[PDB]
Design an enzyme around this catalytic site. Structure first.
Site, PDB file in Angstrom:
ATOM      1  N   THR A 151      -6.106   6.990   7.669  1.00 47.41           N
ATOM      2  CA  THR A 151      -6.593   7.311   6.318  1.00 47.41           C
ATOM      3  C   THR A 151      -6.657   6.085   5.448  1.00 47.41           C
ATOM      4  O   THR A 151      -6.988   6.244   4.240  1.00 47.41           O
ATOM      5  CB  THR A 151      -5.733   8.373   5.665  1.00 47.41           C
ATOM      6  OG1 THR A 151      -4.447   7.803   5.386  1.00 47.41           O
ATOM      7  CG2 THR A 151      -5.646   9.638   6.444  1.00 47.41           C
ATOM      8  N   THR A 152      -6.466   4.904   5.983  1.00 46.98           N
ATOM      9  CA  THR A 152      -6.601   3.645   5.294  1.00 46.98           C
ATOM     10  C   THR A 152      -7.436   2.736   6.161  1.00 46.98           C
ATOM     11  O   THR A 152      -7.500   2.935   7.412  1.00 46.98           O
ATOM     12  CB  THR A 152      -5.237   2.952   5.150  1.00 46.98           C
ATOM     13  OG1 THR A 152      -4.609   2.766   6.432  1.00 46.98           O
ATOM     14  CG2 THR A 152      -4.329   3.763   4.252  1.00 46.98           C
TER      15      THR A 152
ATOM     16  N   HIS B 181       4.035  10.709   6.689  1.00 53.48           N
ATOM     17  CA  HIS B 181       3.390  10.517   7.964  1.00 53.48           C
ATOM     18  C   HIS B 181       4.326   9.740   8.891  1.00 53.48           C
ATOM     19  O   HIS B 181       4.795   8.704   8.560  1.00 53.48           O
ATOM     20  CB  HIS B 181       2.126   9.664   7.771  1.00 53.48           C
ATOM     21  CG  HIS B 181       1.065  10.483   7.078  1.00 53.48           C
ATOM     22  ND1 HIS B 181      -0.013   9.890   6.367  1.00 53.48           N
ATOM     23  CD2 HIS B 181       0.938  11.816   6.997  1.00 53.48           C
ATOM     24  CE1 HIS B 181      -0.749  10.876   5.928  1.00 53.48           C
ATOM     25  NE2 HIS B 181      -0.238  12.047   6.242  1.00 53.48           N
TER      26      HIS B 181
ATOM     27  N   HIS C 295       2.612   9.065   1.045  1.00 55.40           N
ATOM     28  CA  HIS C 295       1.482   9.020   0.074  1.00 55.40           C
ATOM     29  C   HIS C 295       1.909   9.919  -1.039  1.00 55.40           C
ATOM     30  O   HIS C 295       2.467  10.962  -0.835  1.00 55.40           O
ATOM     31  CB  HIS C 295       0.189   9.520   0.723  1.00 55.40           C
ATOM     32  CG  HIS C 295      -0.172   8.793   1.973  1.00 55.40           C
ATOM     33  ND1 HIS C 295      -1.066   7.743   1.987  1.00 55.40           N
ATOM     34  CD2 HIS C 295       0.236   8.954   3.245  1.00 55.40           C
ATOM     35  CE1 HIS C 295      -1.196   7.288   3.212  1.00 55.40           C
ATOM     36  NE2 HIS C 295      -0.414   8.017   4.000  1.00 55.40           N
TER      37      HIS C 295
ATOM     38  N   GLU D 171      -2.450  13.773   1.076  1.00 57.60           N
ATOM     39  CA  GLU D 171      -3.725  13.435   1.629  1.00 57.60           C
ATOM     40  C   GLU D 171      -4.443  14.669   2.117  1.00 57.60           C
ATOM     41  O   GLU D 171      -5.546  14.995   1.660  1.00 57.60           O
ATOM     42  CB  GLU D 171      -3.506  12.446   2.763  1.00 57.60           C
ATOM     43  CG  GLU D 171      -2.845  11.166   2.292  1.00 57.60           C
ATOM     44  CD  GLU D 171      -3.537   9.993   2.929  1.00 57.60           C
ATOM     45  OE1 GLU D 171      -3.166   9.720   4.103  1.00 57.60           O
ATOM     46  OE2 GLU D 171      -4.332   9.259   2.273  1.00 57.60           O
TER      47      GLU D 171
ATOM     48  N   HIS E 144       5.712   6.534   6.757  1.00 62.88           N
ATOM     49  CA  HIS E 144       5.367   6.095   5.384  1.00 62.88           C
ATOM     50  C   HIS E 144       4.970   7.350   4.643  1.00 62.88           C
ATOM     51  O   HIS E 144       4.869   8.420   5.138  1.00 62.88           O
ATOM     52  CB  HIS E 144       4.188   5.062   5.420  1.00 62.88           C
ATOM     53  CG  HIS E 144       2.967   5.615   5.984  1.00 62.88           C
ATOM     54  ND1 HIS E 144       2.611   5.509   7.267  1.00 62.88           N
ATOM     55  CD2 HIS E 144       1.961   6.380   5.423  1.00 62.88           C
ATOM     56  CE1 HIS E 144       1.463   6.202   7.536  1.00 62.88           C
ATOM     57  NE2 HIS E 144       0.996   6.801   6.356  1.00 62.88           N
TER      58      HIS E 144
ATOM     59  N   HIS F 282       0.819  -1.205   0.000  1.00 57.28           N
ATOM     60  CA  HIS F 282       0.000   0.000   0.000  1.00 57.28           C
ATOM     61  C   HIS F 282       0.855   1.258   0.000  1.00 57.28           C
ATOM     62  O   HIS F 282       0.466   2.271  -0.559  1.00 57.28           O
ATOM     63  CB  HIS F 282      -0.973   0.040   1.156  1.00 57.28           C
ATOM     64  CG  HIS F 282      -1.919  -1.105   1.130  1.00 57.28           C
ATOM     65  ND1 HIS F 282      -2.962  -1.296   0.270  1.00 57.28           N
ATOM     66  CD2 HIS F 282      -1.925  -2.169   1.952  1.00 57.28           C
ATOM     67  CE1 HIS F 282      -3.605  -2.411   0.539  1.00 57.28           C
ATOM     68  NE2 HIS F 282      -2.953  -3.003   1.572  1.00 57.28           N
TER      69      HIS F 282
HETATM   70  C1  LIG Z   1      -0.730   3.699   2.867  1.00 55.31           C
HETATM   71  C2  LIG Z   1      -0.164   3.715   4.281  1.00 55.31           C
HETATM   72  O1  LIG Z   1      -1.013   2.948   5.214  1.00 55.31           O
HETATM   73  C3  LIG Z   1      -1.044   3.463   6.520  1.00 55.31           C
HETATM   74  C4  LIG Z   1      -1.663   4.643   6.811  1.00 55.31           C
HETATM   75  F1  LIG Z   1      -2.091   5.353   5.718  1.00 55.31           F
HETATM   76  C5  LIG Z   1      -1.637   5.232   8.076  1.00 55.31           C
HETATM   77  S1  LIG Z   1      -2.124   6.906   8.354  1.00 55.31           S
HETATM   78  N1  LIG Z   1      -2.029   7.630   6.910  1.00 55.31           N
HETATM   79  O2  LIG Z   1      -1.024   7.428   9.194  1.00 55.31           O
HETATM   80  O3  LIG Z   1      -3.475   6.863   8.892  1.00 55.31           O
HETATM   81  C6  LIG Z   1      -1.113   4.446   9.112  1.00 55.31           C
HETATM   82  F2  LIG Z   1      -1.159   4.967  10.367  1.00 55.31           F
HETATM   83  C7  LIG Z   1      -0.535   3.176   8.938  1.00 55.31           C
HETATM   84  N2  LIG Z   1       0.034   2.480   9.978  1.00 55.31           N
HETATM   85  C8  LIG Z   1      -0.537   2.111  11.184  1.00 55.31           C
HETATM   86  C9  LIG Z   1       0.527   1.831  12.324  1.00 55.31           C
HETATM   87  C10 LIG Z   1      -0.027   1.547  13.737  1.00 55.31           C
HETATM   88  C11 LIG Z   1      -0.244   0.036  13.713  1.00 55.31           C
HETATM   89  C12 LIG Z   1      -1.693  -0.247  13.840  1.00 55.31           C
HETATM   90  C13 LIG Z   1      -2.458  -0.500  12.572  1.00 55.31           C
HETATM   91  C14 LIG Z   1      -2.436   0.456  11.356  1.00 55.31           C
HETATM   92  C15 LIG Z   1      -2.025   1.879  11.430  1.00 55.31           C
HETATM   93  C16 LIG Z   1      -0.508   2.712   7.572  1.00 55.31           C
HETATM   94  S2  LIG Z   1       0.228   1.165   7.088  1.00 55.31           S
HETATM   95  O4  LIG Z   1       0.724   0.500   8.229  1.00 55.31           O
HETATM   96  O5  LIG Z   1       1.245   1.463   6.066  1.00 55.31           O
HETATM   97  C17 LIG Z   1      -1.033   0.172   6.442  1.00 55.31           C
HETATM   98  C18 LIG Z   1      -2.196  -0.046   7.477  1.00 55.31           C
HETATM   99  C19 LIG Z   1      -3.273  -0.912   6.810  1.00 55.31           C
HETATM  100  O6  LIG Z   1      -4.182  -1.049   7.903  1.00 55.31           O
HETATM  101 ZN   LIG Z   2      -0.451   7.977   6.020  1.00 58.58          ZN
END
Ligand SMILES: CCOc1c(F)c(S(N)(=O)=O)c(F)c(NC2CCCCCCC2)c1S(=O)(=O)CCCO
Ligand SMILES: [Zn+2]
Ligand SMILES: CCOc1c(F)c(S(N)(=O)=O)c(F)c(NC2CCCCCCC2)c1S(=O)(=O)CCCO
Ligand SMILES: [Zn+2]
Lengths: 261, 260
Positions: A196-197, A115, A91, A102, A89, A64
């Site tokens: 946001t996912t 982020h 976007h 975003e 990570h 992702h």
């Molecule tokens: C495309 C990136 O995906 C995000 C994401 F967009 C966000 S965000 N934009 O900060 O809301 C994320 F926080 C995460 N990671 C997480 C880390 C904390 C572990 C618990 C589960 C998911 C959140 C992640 S992610 O871990 O990369 C994928 C989580 C799929 O549930």
């Molecule tokens: Zn993010």
């Protein structure tokens, strides 16, 4: 099997992930009508962000985005709890349309967004446990503009070609993560929102810095062309592009700013 | 379905699959995706001068206020005749009075009027046309705050009588073309969808370039006059923010009748 495009794209996430259709969703458009100065939003302190260049940190394509794992001795202070880092990570958009932040500001998308995800390590033993809990997560967001080459972001981008496919992992030497932050970190927007996912849990305290950073067109092009959502052996490869959610309705929230003008 | 809460737009696709499909509207109209198309000649609005001896039903349908329009009102200039069925509006709220559906360069206007038409050459009625090829055509007028607009007041003076879901009022015919902006020859055009359930991808959109104005007091009336609930509902909800968020629109162009 969720995606950002086609049958399993963002208008369909709620079919499997009910919170994606619930309240407090992120991201949002930061615009004047919903901003309010809050003098209590004092500077954050970034503790443990200077990671040793003699240590290494795992970079992963999770299908992702690309994420870098961060050590829990990295934390942000100044919140009513301490929050420890778990990962960062990005976007982004695509080569023909490098407009994949975003959050938007006064309706404008930036090129990309970084982020840095943290969890409440006062209350919870790990990020996954925190993720569905009250006050669980705090995300720092940096808006990224197309501009000058950024050697600090290149410490991540120079490893892209080694995490091209889903599930692939590489090691990145430590560097000072505060180099990824913009100028004047004391100036930020703050609001209550969500992941946001999927699963879109409404458990995130967002901090979006007021000032963007720059990375070059060539850095954005590498980010936008290097990665695939799919495994190395998948017969139906999908490029990892346009991995941002549309902005969400406010639902009576305000966004609080640490800057009055 | 609603525009807010658990039955809000991110959940529409559960019951209304098309809301998660192709060609969804509305979109942001911005310079990178625009392309002049010399084929986009002026539309002709025929039958829009509605007899003042006729009345036209205004309804609160719990989602917007709609005016029923007669099928002898039609756009000329498309390959088929498209006959009117109804017009309605979308708006924000007094704290954030920026509730257009389409945006221009990422900016919402105050409100947006839509005049819905159906392909009467091919189909017998709008409901039948709504899920078919070439079925619908919507004209969109962006609304900003400015001078009092007498023409829009021919609708807005009736809102008190359609305060609650289900309520209706009769509006005497007037010239609907008066609701259109200056220089209707200047417009954006693209293929999209209904912006509400069922979200069928069967709409030819025409969004006029130039906005109209209404007064601050007219816009506040629109935003405060209506509820989305029945009169007798013990938990009344104001009808505000009745617009869909913009949709992704990738590898596509919006065509313009103007180059300058
Ligand atoms: C495309 C990136 O995906 C995000 C994401 F967009 C966000 S965000 N934009 O900060 O809301 C994320 F926080 C995460 N990671 C997480 C880390 C904390 C572990 C618990 C589960 C998911 C959140 C992640 S992610 O871990 O990369 C994928 C989580 C799929 O549930
Ligand atoms: Zn993010
Ligand atoms: C909030 C206003 O709702 C719209 C609307 F947003 C649009 S739009 N923005 O032009 O896409 C509509 F076209 C309609 N009415 C159409 C009339 C044609 C009859 C069949 C299906 C309904 C669509 C309607 S509506 O008729 O008011 C409600 C339709 C619910 O299925
Ligand atoms: Zn409409």
């Amino acid at each position: 099997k969720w995606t950002y495009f086609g049958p399993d794209g963002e208008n369909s996430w709620s079919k499997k992930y009910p919170s994606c259709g619930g309240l407090l969703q992120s991201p949002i458009d930061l615009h004047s009508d919903i901003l309010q100065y809050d003098a209590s939003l004092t500077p954050l302190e970034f503790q443990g962000y200077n990671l040793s260049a003699n240590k290494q940190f795992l970079l992963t394509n999770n299908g992702h985005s690309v994420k870098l794992n961060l050590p829990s001795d990295m934390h942000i202070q100044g919140l009513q709890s301490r929050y420890s880092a778990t990962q960062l990570h990005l976007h982004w958009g695509n080569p023909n349309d490098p407009h994949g932040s975003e959050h938007t500001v006064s309706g404008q998308h930036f090129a990309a967004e970084l982020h840095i995800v943290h969890y409440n390590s006062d209350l919870y033993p790990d990020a996954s446990t925190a993720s569905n809990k009250s006050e669980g997560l705090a995300v720092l967001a940096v808006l990224i503009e197309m501009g000058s080459f950024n050697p600090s972001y290149d410490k991540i981008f120079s490893h892209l070609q080694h995490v091209k496919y889903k599930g692939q992992e590489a090691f990145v030497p430590g560097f000072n993560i505060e180099e990824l932050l913009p100028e004047r970190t004391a100036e930020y927007y703050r609001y209550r929102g969500s992941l946001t996912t999927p699963p879109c849990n409404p458990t995130v305290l967002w901090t979006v810095f007021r000032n963007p950073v720059q990375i070059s067109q060539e850095q954005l092009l590498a980010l936008e062309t290097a990665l695939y959502c799919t495994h190395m052996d998948d017969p139906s490869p999908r490029e990892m592009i346009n991995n941002f959610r549309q902005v969400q309705k406010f639902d009576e929230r305000l966004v609080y700013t640490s800057f009055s003008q």
